[model samples]
Target chain A: GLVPRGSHMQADILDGKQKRVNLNSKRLVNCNQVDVNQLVPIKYKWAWEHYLNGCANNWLPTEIPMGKDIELWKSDRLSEDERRVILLNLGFFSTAESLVGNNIVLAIFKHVTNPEARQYLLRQAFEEAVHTHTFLYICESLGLDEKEIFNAYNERAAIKAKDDFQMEITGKVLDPNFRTDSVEGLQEFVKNLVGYYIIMEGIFFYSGFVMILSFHRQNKMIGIGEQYQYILRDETIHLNFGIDLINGIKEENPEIWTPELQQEIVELIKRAVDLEIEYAQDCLPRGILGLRASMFIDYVQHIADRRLERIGLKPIYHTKNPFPWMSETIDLNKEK
Target chain B: SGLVPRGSHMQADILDGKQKRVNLNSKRLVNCNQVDVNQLVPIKYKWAWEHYLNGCANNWLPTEIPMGKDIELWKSDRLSEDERRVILLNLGFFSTAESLVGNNIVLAIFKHVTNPEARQYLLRQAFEEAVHTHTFLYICESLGLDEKEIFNAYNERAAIKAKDDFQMEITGKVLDPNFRTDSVEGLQEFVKNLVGYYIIMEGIFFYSGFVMILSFHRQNKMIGIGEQYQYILRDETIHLNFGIDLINGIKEENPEIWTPELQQEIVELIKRAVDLEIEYAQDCLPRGILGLRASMFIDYVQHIADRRLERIGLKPIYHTKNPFPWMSETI
Candidate 1:
């Protein structure tokens, strides 16, 4: 007598006559209604791993102190270039983090229908908010102009180009006509995934990490650097999980990973390198304090190599590790 | 280069913030389609963020409670066949039911509720729904309930199946990616889905089952499941409050949508849900056990529906007495 006594509504997606939940057809994208949205019997252990990882590293923006950074901003211990480095990082990350949050809430979280991956996506989206919160806290601490800081993503040309690249590459997804059923649509969907996770968070965010944490290594603006390190670790987790998701989507839809699409994906990463190099040039107007614009040129190329190789794409740049001490500053899986 | 990434539902201007100072006066919940969606600075809704803080504090683990008593109570056969049915039935109904909220909040409702603070709260609510789903599995395993059968019980039990099937139908309404809540009709559909979910399913329908489960807790039986339900009940309290605020805010901002017929239709849906809950209650306890009767629960369903109807600014229809008015004192 589990049936309704006399039911008026017929729930189609969950009609009463379905059988047990089978995990065989579980997927990260293009999921059917069956076995689709249940959190139990989690198919992606990677997502659960990433979710637990996010919980294990739960942090807030204000717990780290900003007194020295506040003093540095007021006392003017640094030259114009050093100051620009900090401002550029803040300006890009402030709105950049917000962009990631909106995408997670609006775009990524909508299409990816798996429950556990969604669990992590929810966590990551909140983390992106907190990451933005970290920037605001930094700006407020340093007495920076909110308009200058928040508006630079658009106003500053280099930052605009980078953000523009992500928005452009992910153009199809932002439209009202987006879905993942057709081959072209799914390819575009994967491109969108690569846009947010791989390109934006993974490729675009590294230069700022190097610029800011380089100061952190020297105990200059230690608070901002401290927060950057946590964000770095968080992004590392996001990158790996996203890489896993990319790999998972490939496995789920093998044909979507066509030779042409794979090569196009390679081109996308290479283009990101050029845009980031421009950002490095713009941010480092002149790399005072033992930093140089030239150092990050090789650094960005080297980053592209590791990022490329991880997703089964061969490294095109073949650039050697420039910031070998970068890993010592923050363990980068012992990378370039 | 920044040619209007137009439909991102955010301030899509790529070059400069020429005049977009985020006018707080224009920040209606669903009146305007585009928001900064990213700016946390000029938050217009403090209640939304406060609920986020409230939800963060209200979280707990299902495994914290000792299931030894429940394990023994279930195994010793001390529970009559009637008592056993109530426990299993509540679990079956709740298993699939928890994640319906998760899917809706994350995938559906989150698309339209474009405020950042509210999205923050929605994220917390989604996670809580996930935790409850995860908690049920913990409940199932602790009591040695068959994982496949207990979780998938809705597949077999028409009672559990019917309850969740109705919830999913509301989800089916708003699952399309293009469904924007810009118009009165569009916003009305969004609010109805919210009411059927937060107000009806989580708010009203689950209350009767909570009583049934907590009745076991009251007599010092199955405290583990009862304890988890208590936490879940409080979570639902926050959920309903936030959800009601969302509904009320939408209605207050867009009064044209809440027409008389729409109000009457909402009442009818609540009434139909009341019928479903009572029927499911009877199936839960065809023969009441432990000083509780099935008819009392049917009245309790009507009682809660009237209370819910009143909260959403509708008049009470049932005027029925609570079979156990003492239930509120326990919480």
Candidate 2:
């Protein structure tokens, strides 16, 4: 007579405590149909600390020159050479596409399958805006107008809607489930999403961020670059989420990412990485201050190899990392 | 003679320089739709909103451009020494005004406004205001100066005695030759003129700044610095829209308070204001930067003044094409 209403008597327990019974993770939608604990992915505690120490600290001092000028000028008036260095460095880094890319990521946060994950992404989204805002703040602080930044933004080739890979993944997730969709396509889609969240967001952003730290080390910039230290941490959280999401799904359904699916995904990821590397290089040319594109590409590949090992996948490329500076910056063990 | 609360709805007739009875109760009309979810706010605010949205979209922290960021000397003769000084001085003037206006308006709005939507926008504007004040102070602080130095340098005007400090601060210039001779009329004119100028500054000048900032970024200079502006721009956009809403609300809801006589007085007030700005500009800046001139600034004043008047259902006074046509190019 007191039998559970249309439910199993037994439930899964975590840490010896009973969890609310549910059919699957799909049944765990938060208020916004998002995962409430998205940010609390397994490595969350570590990720937050990583972001705080590695990226956040690097931003204000290394990446932002206006901040350096204000700080240094307070001590000693900025020389003409220092002024030139600051402007050139700012120009070298001011790529609007990267910023717009962050906006697209924010738009995708609304499409998260889990509320917790969505919350994590949302916080990151706001933080990303602040990072870019810090950049503009530095310019404004330097007695500059924001119009130039916008102009540079428009100068780049317009980002076509179809060109966005992440949006395609999010669109598929949000759209009504259709019978016409092939299982192969679905697997491939999930793989791409995982690749971005794990490698691009985690490895690519952090690796690029290490270059910003290098600039700080050179004393070319300070204070403003410290903000990058936080971004590095946030991106790492996203990276871990990618690893957990894909690995968990694999654990639940190992057959989903078959050998064929893995090959297809590797190819797709290869193309994406190629494009990103090209873009990074194009955005920052040679003879300019800071890191080089070839160095960044090497850094990307090295991190890719490490990420592959972590997720129980084979490293495809045999390329040794030309840029060891990245490991030095991101090898931060400060995050427990 | 004007009665108590010269700006009060009840004393509108007096403010208009007319003797007609101003019906106070009739000024209580409301336009509900004036507040909305999605409106194409004026360019002035749109540029700022773009920045704000960008900042919100990114996780950037705060920064500022200390020392007016004058790069003319590095430009290989793009601007003469006099021109560069003018550029730096004008930028300094604008930056200081931006800080002050952002401070006063935000402080006032946060204290008084109750609507959640308007209040939300006001809060965002207030945060940005603090950021803007820092942007100005950042430059000053970087240049071995502090807030007081810039505040005093920028806000140095003769003192006034009759009105309360707040009133005098907002309406009366300390030692206006016109105000000293005709304090009542001069004060009324000054207040009206300031309202009109602020409407345009909130709408046009800021828009121009947005365009210019983005242009600098286009040249690949100060990229991060420019991105920060998107946040400030976003806040200013909300501010200008709020101002537009206020002016529009007064126009429709309080017709008796906004009579034809007030309209004419507003026009005369604006003319005097234009002349005042010219004098202020001349005294502050004998020569302006490359691509900017005092003559051109006068034209900009008329162009903006006329545009604001027309937007609010008033007749245009100046008939020339826009003096600052380049502003629209970027917008």
Candidate 3:
């Protein structure tokens, strides 16, 4: 039998959809904004540090299942403190990178650049969102609020380009020629993201994770350290992605680094090393296990030099094995 | 390496997606490592991934409002704060772009679908979709709230939970999975019975609703109002595009999903929607309004259905080309 004609197809579709809306009105809460005073203060350096650490810790939920294939946990070469520092550092860096991606997305839709870039940025954001959620699950498992973690990124002080974590070297690296509008400069920045993402995130993160796992191996902070392992795994995936992206970008545009860009990037590494050294000094000032502030600073520069040389760049610091044992204690277990 | 070269066979992509499997070759592989074939997505989940991308990457979406596009809807932001002193209310009537039939259809599937494992994931998606709808509602309420009569076709008494006994009985029986999905044809017909689900409700109704917002924003006011609409529009655009893509995919790869009987069923469903829209227009437009007209609406609905049919690889049954062509101009 022919269906009886009622309201036209359009009306029916509307009505059908209209039926799905849930207005249970279960909650009696009033619609009001959250109180600002209740929020964690944004200016404090520890706030950013904790937030980043929390954020990085969040990625563990989704990352662990993937990382299980890599046999990430069998060997131990690092100390407990080393692992905590590494995971916390990775947490901050990923959050910062995500923020940059978000900025690009907003800038694009506001009609700032090419539509393709806008589309690409959209995908990147999704990746970050999933990354963020995965990170949050890990954080919650460790009894931390996501807001506390995300708020770690200090808001731009209107003019300062670098934040507290990587300030020292970045402060010295400021150059005016790296134009945002220029395609060449933008390409240069993207290529550098590859380096920062892969080497800084992948190798450095895993290297540091070894230490955190050492704590887990000893039974204290086991759950928190489990979360770290998961994050380490996911960060490694992201790092691998960076490697693939950088190789692709390099293949497409080999001229991303002008001598000028090289200089800027050099300055970037120096500042990062300087900040690492200062932070190391603060954390291990009197020296834990005979590792004093001066030796730690020297070790930071040495590691920084190694990282730079491996990336096919010149080392800014003249440093040697002030702490050769650092590797003996930090070498990542590649065996699964 | 372009494992599947672009512009190869038409079915190449679908074949690859369905065939691609993660090799369980590692030593860690155990009997526990099992996934139901039916549960596995033939298409990459990323095909439906644009929403997450928008939120995480963008300041929550694809917000580039082009010049002169929906420019008039920006005015609601500037209105004086006439703090709520509501005395009485009345009834009213209404309704983007990007072809995303896949998203809308997928939303329907995700909402109603029930599987032990898929439920959580689908619900998360549906939850986001509900948020997407709220975003659109915010856009509508922002601009057209004052002028709108919110309760013409939408009577609180007629809500699904409040339906007449007979209607409830029928709805329950009709919703029974056995009755609904006995055959591909039956399922398709059942899905098409809610053709208004895609057509008037999402495509036309929402479009008419947004026109009202655009009308107000044309006055160079409502900047925040327009900005708010940007996120909603971006979401809806993705959703609409998703629906379109899904429908197209269904028609192409799985034509069995839309059998000849299903097409006829959908045609009848579209006719039913046209009548309901006419009824809705009559119910709300007792006093003449400037924008919505009965003739213009019929033309617009037919135009949309005809386009939808074409995209879904079906013959266009309606004679009308886009009746209100200007409605589609900005989007």
Candidate 4:
């Protein structure tokens, strides 16, 4: 009797022979209580593909040469204001990369239970660390203020505000009481996902990426900018992976996504956009290399709208991208 | 209302206006619970990054290995009764055992090991576990073995059950809700768990099973899946080396935690693992396979456990030489 040997234990008295465990769709635990080994009959095949894509896109930061960026730093062609903007970008990203890495390993890895999905998330965490290492390498190469750059999120007002907004969203899921078993739990998980994936990585990072990549457009700091392009490509897959997870969760637990929760998500994006706009204004006080402060602000809104649309929400800012050239720069898939 | 505190070390106190600075080097390693994920603090454990990079370079997928030849050998009389038993036992045991190892890592080890570089390597090892599981599934489907029997062997078979249960007890102890690695007892618990996994489970149990599969390849049977075992052996070596380094690192950091009592407990753990594996080997190869005796495997298990013990600075229970000296060729 596969059921139990104890007389006190309840079992079906009729006694149909026990069925053997098989590898099929029915045995698949599509939810978070997944067996870490059973990835086949893969409940989410796309995650498997994403894992492969993540592996294929792997590149160590040390591969990219920063000799040109070093020369660019020492050259007379760069104005003091331009170099300050470079310093600001370097300072902001150095710590921001570690925050995203922290969120992945600490906040996200334990919550997502599917082996394949967890596999991809682990890859994303490693990539985020690599991104952090890349910035450190750049700072070391340029001989910048190490302490200032590494601790910028704590020092800069705008960066602090942006990180705080994202951290507030991520902090809810870190609570010990938080579990992904019920509708309330699902809502909290979704908020954390939207916060980490959509607001922070999708919008905030994209804005910063455009600012740095813009410098490369003028043949300035091409080496560091090349690394940004690789990171952008990785983030594209990450953003797509997050959207897929959100949609999959919504689809599986349709009851969790109420109209009220949807509105809350929209409002979350709205707040993120406002923070990005303010942060962008500070990062580019006037302009650097013909890129205006307002253009970056508008670009953040544009990216936010696109993110919202992908997650099946109404567009908060119905504005077109101010820097269409930004898209052309980060087209790593086709370029590679 | 200045930022500098009064009576603080001010090197240029005679100046009209000045700011005080705090030296970053004044910080010391705090309790494991107080560690931050930023990793901005100067790296104290440099070896972890090297292991992390090695793990990345060892990236592979189970699907990469072809199993058409294995399917053919499984159908033909090329495999003896004992040989077939060996394959099924190894497949079933490894398929589920990898998941247990992966879960223990994410649920217990990763939560305790606060080093970001070490976390990176652990994550890499976790992914490799998934790849190993996939390798077993690929073999199971290729051979058309009864999936239920194959998957459930870990629980149903006494030998695998013994091995898994032993490791589970160690892992489960650390996974307690209030478990913290800051105290001497807590640190000892962490080390004991590490011994159960890295030294006993991966280092000893997995090596015996690997030798069994690779032995088949030596006789020109089950070659395809045997190649997969070769790759897994390579990965396990990295994992074992990493584990040894991690265990040593913990001992170096918390010297008081490595007491004689704890060292004796670790020796007992490996001895217990060797006994379970030897019993399983007896059951798996009662009549032996392809000129290899079951006693040879028993010797092999002891040999592996002895090597692992020596690596962690413990005395060996069995100072035996390689009984199956030629078996090293297969690995």
> In terms of lDDT, which candidate is strongest?
1
The predicted structure with the larger DockQ, 1 or 4, is 1
DockQ, all candidates in order: 0.22, 0.01, 0.02, 0.19
lDDT (tens digit, per residue) of candidate 2 on A103-183: 223223323344233323434443444444455555555444333332322223211111345445333443224211355
The number of the candidate with the highest DockQ is: 1
What local lDDT does model 4 show for residue B267? 82
- For the candidates in turn, chain A alone yields TM-scores of 0.92, 0.63, 0.49, 0.89
Ranking by TM-score, best first?
A: 1, 4, 2, 3
Off by over 4 Å in 3: A1-129, A132-336, B1-46, B50-108, B111-128, B132-153, B156-196, B219-230, B251-253, B282-284, B287-294, B321-323
Name model 4 segments beyond 4 Å from true: A1-37, A328-336, B1-36, B66-77, B141-149, B324-331
Extract clashing residue pairs from model 1.
A2-B158, A2-B159, A3-B158, A3-B159
Residue-wise C-alpha lDDT for candidate 1, range A12-58, written one tens digit per residue: 33544355567776778877756664566668888888876775566
What DockQ was computed for model 3? 0.02
- Tell me the lDDT of model 3 at B195: 42
Error of 2 at A63 (Å): 14
lDDT (Cα, tens digit) per residue for candidate 4, span B32-82: 434344545345556776877777676676677777777766666655666
